[PDB]
Amino acid sequence: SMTDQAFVTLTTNDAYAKGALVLGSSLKQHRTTRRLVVLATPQVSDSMRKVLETVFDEVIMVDVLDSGDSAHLTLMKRPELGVTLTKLHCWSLTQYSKCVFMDADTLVLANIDDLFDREELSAAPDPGWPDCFNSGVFVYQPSVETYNQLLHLASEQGSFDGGDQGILNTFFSSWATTDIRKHLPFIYNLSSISIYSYLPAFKVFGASAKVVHFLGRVKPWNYTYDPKTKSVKSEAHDPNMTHPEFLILWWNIFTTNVLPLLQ
Amino acid sequence: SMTDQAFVTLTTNDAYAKGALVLGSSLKQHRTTRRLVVLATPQVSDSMRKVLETVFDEVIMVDVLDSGDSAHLTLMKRPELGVTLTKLHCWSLTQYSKCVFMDADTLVLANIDDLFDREELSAAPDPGWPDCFNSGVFVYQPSVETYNQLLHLASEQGSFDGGDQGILNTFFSSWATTDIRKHLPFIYNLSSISIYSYLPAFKVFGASAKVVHFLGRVKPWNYTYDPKTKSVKSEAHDPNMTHPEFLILWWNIFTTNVLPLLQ
Ligand SMILES: O=c1ccn([C@@H]2O[C@H](COP(=O)(O)OP(=O)(O)O[C@H]3O[C@H](CO)[C@@H](O)[C@H](O)[C@H]3O)[C@@H](O)[C@H]2O)c(=O)[nH]1
Ligand SMILES: O=c1ccn([C@@H]2O[C@H](COP(=O)(O)OP(=O)(O)O[C@H]3O[C@H](CO)[C@@H](O)[C@H](O)[C@H]3O)[C@@H](O)[C@H]2O)c(=O)[nH]1
Numbered sequence: 399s400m401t402d403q404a405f406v407t408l409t410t411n412d413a414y415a416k417g418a419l420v421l422g423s424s425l426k427q428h429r430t431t432r433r434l435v436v437l438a439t440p441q442v443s444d445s446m447r448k449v450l451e452t453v454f455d456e457v458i459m460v461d462v463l464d465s466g467d468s469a470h471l472t473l474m475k476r477p478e479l480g481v482t483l484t485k486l487h488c489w490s491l492t493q494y495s496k497c498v499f500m501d502a503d504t505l506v507l508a509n510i511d512d513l514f515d516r517e518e519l520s521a522a523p524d525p526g527w528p529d530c531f532n533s534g535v536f537v538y539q540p541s542v543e544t545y546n547q548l549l550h551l552a553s554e555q556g557s558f559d560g561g562d563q564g565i566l567n568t569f570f571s572s573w574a575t576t577d578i579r580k581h582l583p584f585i586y587n588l589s590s591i592s593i594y595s596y597l598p599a600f601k602v603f604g605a606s607a608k609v610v611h612f613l614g615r616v617k618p619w620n621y622t623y624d625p626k627t628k629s630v631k632s633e634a635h636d637p638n639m640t641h642p643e644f645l646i647l648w649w650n651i652f653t654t655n656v657l658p659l660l661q
Numbered sequence: 662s663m664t665d666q667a668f669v670t671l672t673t674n675d676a677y678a679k680g681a682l683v684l685g686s687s688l689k690q691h692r693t694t695r696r697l698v699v700l701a702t703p704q705v706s707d708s709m710r711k712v713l714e715t716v717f718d719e720v721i722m723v724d725v726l727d728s729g730d731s732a733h734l735t736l737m738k739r740p741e742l743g744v745t746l747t748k749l750h751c752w753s754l755t756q757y758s759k760c761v762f763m764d765a766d767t768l769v770l771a772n773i774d775d776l777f778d779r780e781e782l783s784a785a786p787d788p789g790w791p792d793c794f795n796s797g798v799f800v801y802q803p804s805v806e807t808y809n810q811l812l813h814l815a816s817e818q819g820s821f822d823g824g825d826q827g828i829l830n831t832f833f834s835s836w837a838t839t840d841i842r843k844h845l846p847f848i849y850n851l852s853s854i855s856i857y858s859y860l861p862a863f864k865v866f867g868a869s870a871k872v873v874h875f876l877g878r879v880k881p882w883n884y885t886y887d888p889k890t891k892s893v894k895s896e897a898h899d900p901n902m903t904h905p906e907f908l909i910l911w912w913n914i915f916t917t918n919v920l921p922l923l924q
């Protein structure tokens with residue numbers, strides 16, 4: 399609990415760092431008793447690393463890993479996600495016994511320390527292709543064995559989607575079919591696109607949501623926010639705007655709790 | 662190979678009847694050893710019922726059940742699906758010990774009689790909210806107890822989505838968290854919206870598809886199909902056009918196997 403377990407995020411730049419900052423703040427807000435760790439790469443500015451060190455217990459510098467897999471990334475319309483291979487470094491954190499990896503585009507709404515009851519690999523179904531798990535929230539065990547197997551698989555075969563999710567699903571191939579306890583409830587990784595696709599289910603189950611995931615190309619930090627009125631300017635067909643209170647929450651935490659540390 | 666097990670579909674009109682007929686035809690194509698059963702309501706024309714009788718071993722006349730739940734159905738942009746409550750009559754078929762219910766907008770691509778190895782209630786996850794099962798394909802056990810419990814729950818509480826899926830998820834509430842064998846692989850209910858949302862996963866796993874589900878407001882029978890070239894006309898953002906070969910297969914079956922019996 400105290401020091402052998404951690405939440406772990408990743409940021410390769412100052413843009414996703416604002417996300418990592420909001421995530422870590424929300425984990426603090428909901429009183430985690432676990433360490434907070436962030437993986438960062440050299441593009442993150444020196445000043446931003448310093449700010450990350452005020453929220454996170456440790457900022458750990460790693461090299462970018464980039465799939466360069468243009469084909470499969472285009473197939474997803476996410477040409478910019480080749481560097482998500484950098485996530486594989488999370489397995490190197492052998493200073494911890496068990497960890498929860500959380501995408502820097504997530505936001506915690508409730509304490510989720512009970513995720514440490516789960517065993518590797520435990521993750522929520524991915525909307526869209528639900529026999530694959532979504533790699534935005536997952537419980538794992540750091541291991542030089544696993545780390546190096548994953549790096550080898552990455553270098554030899556790559557990823558079916560050009561990012562971390564394909565390779566992680568291929569490596570952890572039994573998830574769909576084995577042990578229901580490794581299927582985390584969707585309320586630990588609620589994507590805005592599920593709120594948009596089956597709003598009736600969200601109206602009935604959505605109040606129990608513990609983690610919201612701002613999945614997709616447009617990230618919370620790309621919206622224009624007005625803190626006087628607590629409003630965002632938005633464009634047609636936006637899954638974030640079905641239930642925009644999550645996005646406004648993100649911005650509220652940024653504006654009041656993160657912006658002062660960026661002074 | 663066993664006569665007291667059946668595939669079961671539903672049609673409340675002559676439009677979805679074309680769907681049922683292609684489904685039935687596809688189940689014959691792939692050598693099912695089970696009985697074929699369609700539930701029909703008084704809107705289905707006399708002549709169409711006779712056509713159904715050439716494909717289906719049993720055509721069974723039941724009364725429409727309609728949620729009238731305009732609020733929840735609108736929430737989903739499916740105003741027309743209140744009549745999907747009629748599906749609950751599938752539990753009345755006590756002449757059969759086990760059945761697979763399949764939507765009239767599914768198409769079989771491979772023998773799926775191994776679905777009868779499963780118990781009630783086995784269904785594939787729903788791509789939008791994957792802690793709910795999709796009610797387009799499901800394995801169940803006809804029963805007077807279950808049938809009446811469902812009609813009662815439908816009458817007094819209704820359905821969180823205005824249709825069958827919501828009430829069946831509420832009734833079979835343990836599905837997300839209990840017994841992984843009851844989570845059918847997505848290849849037994851592959852919705853075209855998953856092909857569209859995560860194309861990389863489809864490119865790697867799609868060859869294994871056993872059933873395709875043309876879920877959504879626009880149905881294969883709503884398309885303009887040219888049998889000479891084997892093409893359909895379509896408008897932007899149509900997830901059936903990501904991998905249109907399935908749509909075309911539906912129409913090839915329809916044109917060659919079914920249409921001659923209608924006109
Ligand atoms: O330029 C980047 C891009 C991503 N990230 C990190 O990698 C994560 C994944 O990227 P993200 O933009 O959140 O991807 P998603 O929009 O969430 O989309 C999917 O795309 C990937 C598929 O391989 C997976 O990483 C995700 O979990 C999955 O939800 C981010 O949260 C960050 O932690 C960076 O640090 N820098
Ligand atoms: O006017 C109708 C409408 C539907 N049906 C039958 O009911 C099924 C369900 O309707 P469908 O149009 O296929 O719904 P979907 O587009 O597949 O969308 C969702 O809509 C419902 C939600 O409650 C569930 O029935 C579905 O399985 C679920 O996938 C159809 O296949 C038919 O068997 C009719 O007979 N007549």
Ligand SMILES: OC[C@H]1O[C@H](O)[C@H](O)[C@@H](O)[C@@H]1O
Nearest residue numbers: 474476524525526614858859
């Ligand atoms: O933004 C690209 C995304 O497309 C999808 O709809 C998938 O469900 C998601 O996991 C993927 O990474």
Ligand SMILES: [Mn+2]
Nearest residue numbers: 501503534613
């Ligand atoms: Mn993400």
Ligand SMILES: [Mn+2]
Nearest residue numbers: 764766797876
């Ligand atoms: Mn359907």
